[PDB]
DNA sequence: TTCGCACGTGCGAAA
DNA sequence: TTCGCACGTGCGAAA
Ligand SMILES: OC[C@H]1O[C@H](O[C@H]2[C@H](O)[C@@H](O)[C@@H](O)O[C@@H]2CO)[C@H](O)[C@@H](O)[C@@H]1O
């Protein structure tokens with residue numbers, strides 16, 4: 038739990054938390070506040086559960102697509118810095134991270150997925166998804182493989198599903214039609230059927246995850262992988278001579294990844310609101326603060342106008358943005374979670390053969406639009422059934438008391454119902470069949 | 474699923490899976506059989522779910538306490554090693570992997586928790602748990618702390634709980650008594666009360682987990698920690714000059730850590746059983762094989778006598794074994810999982826203040842002693858309640874059909890029963906109050 | 910051991 | 925939207 042005079046941080050484990058801790062130490066020595074950095078599993082899930090009761094960290098670090106839903110359950114609101122602080126940063130970044138006209142986190146970077154290939158096994162990477170299966174055959178003879186990426190999180194598979202026209206939600210009339218989904222359209226069918234085919238033809242495995250894909254590339258067993266800028270520092274420590282390049286096309290159409298803006302939301306239950314902002318704006322949104330974090334794990338296209346002009350000329354960042362221009366920024370609406378859960382179920386079930394591509398995407402189309410029942414709606418159901426059982430319980434209580442039926446020493450209510458049935462002129466069989 | 478002619482292995486993320494991968498690479502070089510090593514989260518729980526349907530890996534690596542529950546479910550191949558090979562390992566390691574007379578896993582190493590301390594900060598490690606809060610007072614004056622360890626897994630807190638008399642199950646007459654659970658006795662109460670006292674007096678944090686303590690000791694913010702031999706390699710590459718020593722005493726009695734034998738079991742659904750037995754016997758359980766895994770992450774006191782005579786020359790191993798002699802080998806009985814879940818819930822609830830020490834431990838004793846109903850018993854309950862509902866359903870079906878009781882278009886069963894009551898000479902109030 | 914009511918939510922109906 | 929039966933398991937009783 039929170040407490041005054043301290044600062045705790047929740048960032049994803051694949052991020053530069055150790056470089057984030059190097060500056061929290063620089064903050065501590067300056068004005069006396071100990072800063073600790075923790076990278077918990079499933080932090081984007083634990084936060085909306087615990088912070089309702091006042092728990093959680095002072096600041097949470099996640100991409101912006103969840104954040105509007107976090108704002109909607111009242112976990113942050115109304116963050117305002119001065120314009121000197123509002124403009125040492127990019128206008129598109131603020132737009133994504135503002136829910137209903139209110140800034141809800143400090144944007145920290147811009148991330149997109151790109152194709153990462155080893156120049157040693159693949160001097161010329163493939164430009165198209167369609168030549169991938171033939172490539173894997175040439176590399177399977179040498180003992181290696183073509184492509185391995187995270188098939189568990191749909192973030193990595195969406196560039197291919199969207200390539201031929203699948204869309205999460207449609208933007209029209211200055212608004213996201215939170216009903217209109219395009220996970221069941223013919224475009225999504227072409228994308229997923231190709232991915233499932235890659236698995237059916239043994240070019241990829243349906244159980245592949247992050248560690249499985251990251252290890253196969255860093256050890257040189259797989260020519261290409263699909264990852265974000267955070268994965269670069271790990272490939273740097275390995276003996277792999279890699280290049281970052283545009284993701285391959287599918288049916289002459291580009292791959293369209295979902296672009297994420299890493300953001301720091303201040304917990305509305307924190308007591309360190311201003312102290313945390315002291316960390317945010319004055320000690321880590323500086324050149325030297327982003328350096329310490331980027332040296333550990335590359336943030337990607339950082340959003341600080343000052344620091345980014347140094348990073349934008351790294352050819353790896355330039356390729357990361359060639360992929361992002363081809364993609365779309367992620368909606369921050371609360372129904373992102375329902376869409377992300379549904380498509381995750383679709384890919385996993387279609388990759389494993391539990392469902393057809395038709396059945397998985399059709400089920401995902403309805404799940405991504407499903408409404409979560411309110412707390413009041415749940416309690417209304419609970420209370421109504423609680424009343425029902427109470428009404429029946431009182432009735433049978435009186436029948437067992439004053440009925441004086443010929444009942445066994447112990448018997449369920451159905452026996453009482455039967456005995457009271459025959460008194461009214463009915464005959465009840467063994468299985469409950471009743472008549473006059 | 475597992476393919477014929479391939480080997481896939483599951484080991485915990487804190488072990489040297491990269492070292493184990495190099496052993497598989499040599500196995501691939503001599504027999505042409507690819508070996509893939511994965512470290513998925515919650516593998517101790519994932520395995521009994523997938524392996525029942527014939528899925529899971531070929532070989533699973535875990536401490537020996539979980540294997541008996543696996544074997545009772547028929548998930549493991551029975552280990553058939555030559556008598557000549559069984560003599561190559563310490564006999565008591567074979568005992569940890571014996572269940573119902575059969576051998577069910579290949580014992581790899583012996584693991585016991587020890588006190589790891591920073592020699593530069595604390596040259597003389599405290600010999601007693603009770604003197605630790607005083608050590609923290611001196612330490613807080615430097616901005617440091619004394620002790621930090623994983624508070625989320627009961628494996629780390631148990632040596633304190635067991636010191637003054639707590640135990641899991643009592644051994645008597647050649648078997649463990651699953652109904653004699655000692656997580657509620659006075660010794661276990663005092664041990665946990667002390668730990669909760671450390672948290673109440675701000676000498677330790679209840680949210681502390683593995684990565685938080687491992688990061689803080691390696692970064693030199695705490696002078697002591699509690700961890701097994703696997704954690705040394707990260708400290709080695711760190712700047713801390715460290716020593717491994719016996720765990721401190723509590724009320725004059727030593728801490729009694731549960732001793733675990735890292736073991737490799739063979740999935741019963743594996744068409745590569747002969748291949749898995751070959752890889753474990755002639756490539757891993759050798760000097761060169763265990764050395765490769767050990768150089769990655771220290772295994773501890775290996776079961777193989779030939780390589781252990783070399784590893785025993787290590788003062789850190791002779792200290793790890795000094796703690797082991799004061800502790801106990803875990804049971805491998807299937808109830809161990811239920812004991813681990815109960816104590817895990819208790820320590821977390823007590824460390825957080827959600828429950829008292831007396832309430833949490835009393836609930837842990839009933840949970841760890843609760844008899845898990847068999848599948849058939851669960852099914853019996855499900856069918857009996859299904860039959861009870863169908864009987865009531867047929868009665869209300871016939872009442873609605875031949876009653877003509879003069880009720881609305883739609884109405885619940887309670888109203889039909891109400892209408893039948895008045896037909897038989899009763900009256901029913903709104904809340905169900907019923908009499909003649 | 911079996912047994913039966915309680916419990917909160919699922920699923921779809923009826924509107 | 926509210927509604928109501930079905931669902932499988934919890935808890936405790938009776939033995
Ligand atoms: O898989 C759904 C998941 O996708 C995105 O998560 C990314 C995240 O943006 C990256 O920073 C990194 O952590 O990889 C993640 C995928 O594993 C969305 O941001 C997230 O909301 C969504 O759940």
Ligand SMILES: OC[C@H]1O[C@H](O[C@H]2[C@H](O)[C@@H](O)[C@@H](O)O[C@@H]2CO)[C@H](O)[C@@H](O)[C@@H]1O
Pocket residue numbers: 485487517536537538539584626627628629701733813
């Ligand atoms: O915390 C309960 C846990 O204790 C043991 O797990 C140990 C394991 O023996 C070590 O190899 C290492 O991984 O630390 C683990 C605890 O985090 C038991 O073996 C395990 O069954 C139990 O769940």
